[PDB]
Swiss-Prot record, chains A, B:
GO terms for molecular function: DNA-binding transcription factor activity; transcription cis-regulatory region binding. Disulfide bonds: none annotated. Keywords: DNA-binding, Repressor, Transcription, Transcription regulation. Transmembrane segments: none annotated. It comes from Mycobacterium tuberculosis (strain CDC 1551 / Oshkosh). InterPro entries: EthR_C, Homeodomain-like_sf, HTH-type_TetR-like_transc_reg, HTH_TetR, Tet_transcr_reg_TetR-rel_C_sf. Residues 1-60 form the HTH tetR-type domain. Homodimer. Residues 23-42 bind DNA. This is HTH-type transcriptional regulator EthR.
Length: 191, 191
C-alpha cells in the first residue's frame, strides 16, 4: 500500500541515479509519508532495493516455472530461446533494478545470497533439461551437464546485463537474444 | 625499485584483505619507506591497484600477442585452448589482483577504462581469428563474428573470475578451461 508506493518511488529514482544518491527522505517524499513513517515499512534504503530485486528475481523465476509446466510446441532452438527470453524480458523490463541490484552484490550479503540462491536454481533446471535432452538421444554426452549449465548461466548474466547497461564492450540489446541462443544451442547439441 | 617493493607489498596484502582495509601506512611499512615517501611513487593506494592491474592485463595481452606471432602446430580445439589458457594462467596466477581489480571497476573510472580497452582489443582479435577461420572454410558463417566474440569474451570474464573466487555458483577451477574451450569450439564451428 504505502509499501508499494515506497517501492515504486525507489524504482523510479534508480532510473536517474545510484542508490548512494537516494536518501530515506527522497523515498519518504515520493510515497507521501514522513521519514520515521518510512521505518515502519523498511529498516533502510538498502532493504528497499533488496525487496525490489527479490520481486524481479521471483518474477523471472515464476515465468520460467510457467514455461517448464507449459511446454511450447516448437523446435529445440525455439525451446531454449523461450527460456533465455524470460531473463531478457524480465530483467530488461527492470533495467534500473537490475543495475542497482547487481552493484549491491558487492556490499550486501543479503543481495549476494539472493542472487546466488536463484542462480543455483536456474543452473540446476538448465542441467536437468540438458540431461533430459541427452536421455532422449537429442544431445550428445559431452561436458558434465551441470558445468556446461553453470558457464552458460554466467555467460547470460554478464552478457544480458552488459547489454542492458550499454557497457563497452557489449552485444547490442537488439542482437543479444539471438547471440545467446546460438551459443546455448551449439554448445548443448554440438559434438 | 622502492616502486617494485610497494607493488609487491600491495599484492601480498590483497591476498588477506580488501583494498578498503589496506592503509597507505601498510604499503609504506612493507616497502621500508615512510608515508610521505610513498607519495613520491604513487598518489593513492587506488593508483597502486591500478598499476598492479595494468601489469597483469599487459602480461596477458603480451602472452596472447606471443601466441598470435608463434602459431602452435595443433588442431583447432587446441588452438582455442592455448588462447583461453593465457587468461586462465595469467589472471589465475594473480587471483588477489584479479579480485580487487574487478571490484575497483565499480569505483575507479581509470580501472573501468583499462578493463574496457583491453576487452575491446581481445574481442577484436577473437573476431579476426573467427573471420580467418570462416575465410578458410573451416567455420560456418553463422552469427556476426564480433557479436559472437563479445559474448564468448564476457562468458570467460565472468566464468574464470567466479571460478578463481570460488563463488557459488562457479565451475570448479580444475574444470573451467575444458568447459570454456567446449563452448568456444562448438559455438565457432557449429552450424
Ligand atoms: C524453459 C525451457 C523450455 C528452456 C530452458 N531455459 C533455461 C534457462 C535457464 C537460465 C537462463 C539464464 O539466462 N540464466 C541467467 C539468468 C540471468 F539473470 F543471470 F541472466 C536461460 C535459460 C533452462 S531450461
Ligand atoms: C591465440 C589463438 C591461437 C586463439 C585465440 N584466442 C583468443 C582469445 C581471446 C580472448 C579470450 C578471453 O578469455 N577473453 C576474456 C579475458 C578475461 F580476462 F576477461 F577473462 C580467450 C581467447 C583470441 S584468438
Amino acid at each position: 500500500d504505502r509499501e508499494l508506493a515506497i517501492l515504486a518511488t525507489a524504482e523510479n529514482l534508480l532510473e536517474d541515479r545510484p542508490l548512494a544518491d537516494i536518501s530515506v527522505d527522497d523515498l519518504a517524499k515520493g510515497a507521501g509519508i514522513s521519514r520515521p513513517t518510512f521505518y515502519f515499512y523498511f529498516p533502510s534504503k538498502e532493504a528497499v532495493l533488496l525487496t525490489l530485486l527479490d520481486r524481479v528475481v521471483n518474477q523471472a523465476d515464476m515465468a520460467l516455472q510457467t514455461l517448464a509446466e507449459n511446454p511450447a510446441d516448437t523446435d529445440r532452438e525455439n525451446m531454449w530461446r523461450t527460456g533465455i527470453n524470460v531473463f531478457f524480458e524480465t530483467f530488461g523490463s527492470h533495467k534500473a533494478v537490475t543495475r542497482a541490484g547487481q552493484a549491491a552484490r558487492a556490499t550486501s550479503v543479503e543481495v549476494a545470497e539472493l542472487w546466488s540462491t536463484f542462480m543455483q536454481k536456474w543452473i540446476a533446471y538448465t542441467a536437468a533439461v540438458i540431461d533430459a535432452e541427452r536421455d532422449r538421444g537429442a544431445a550428445p554426452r559431452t561436458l558434465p551437464a551441470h558445468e556446461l549449465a553453470t558457464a552458460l548461466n554466467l555467460m547470460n548474466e554478464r552478457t544480458l546485463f552488459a547489454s542492458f547497461a550499454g557497457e563497452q564492450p557489449s552485444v547490442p540489446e537488439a542482437r543479444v537474444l539471438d547471440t545467446l541462443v546460438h551459443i546455448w544451442v551449439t554448445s548443448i547439441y554440438g559434438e
